[PDB]
Design a protein around this ligand. Structure first.
Ligand SMILES: [Cl-]
Ligand SMILES: [Cl-]
Length: 162
């Protein structure tokens, strides 16, 4: 298992523009196009992102491409964030993937706000971090996915994904 497979399971794959769990226009493997309620804006962002007149539909290779760019960027965002980096550097590989998953979902900014949990992760207090992480809008809005990431941080295994 790896970050790519993990996220492909959490986000799924859709080749036509859809609305995500927050009602925002997205495409491919959880690639957010826009927070605007205009399908046109969405289509415009899509064209711009792929580099062609898409008409709201893309190919699988196209989706994979956005996915790679997006994973790459999440990592880079982590490495550039003063709050995130130290945590990521302290973690094992399985656990790093869970952090990446959260940043991909909520952005660097969002995750950087989980101060208490971040501290607990840094300290390697697995159970305590899991409990704190669960006290969040994130958990309450997407509990199944949140449960999987949380278990992942708790166990340092891919169990939640097999
Ligand atoms: Cl892009
Ligand atoms: Cl969920």
């Amino acid at each position: 298992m790896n970050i790519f497979e993990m996220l492909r399971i959490d986000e799924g794959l859709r080749l036509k523009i859809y609305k995500d769990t927050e009602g925002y226009y997205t495409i491919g493997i959880g690639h957010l196009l826009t927070k605007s309620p205009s399908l046109n804006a969405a289509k415009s962002e899509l064209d711009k992102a792929i580099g062609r007149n898409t008409n709201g539909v893309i190919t699988k290779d196209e989706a994979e491409k956005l996915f790679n760019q997006d994973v790459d960027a999440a990592v880079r965002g982590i490495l550039r964030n003063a709050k995130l980096k130290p945590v990521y550097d302290s973690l094992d590989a399985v656990r790093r993937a869970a952090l990446i998953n959260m940043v991909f979902q909520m952005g660097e900014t969002g995750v950087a706000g989980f101060t208490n949990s971040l501290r607990k992760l840094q300290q390697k207090r697995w159970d305590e971090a899991a409990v704190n992480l669960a006290k969040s809008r994130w958990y309450n809005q997407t509990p199944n996915r949140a449960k999987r990431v949380i278990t992942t941080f708790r166990t340092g295994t891919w169990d939640a994904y097999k």
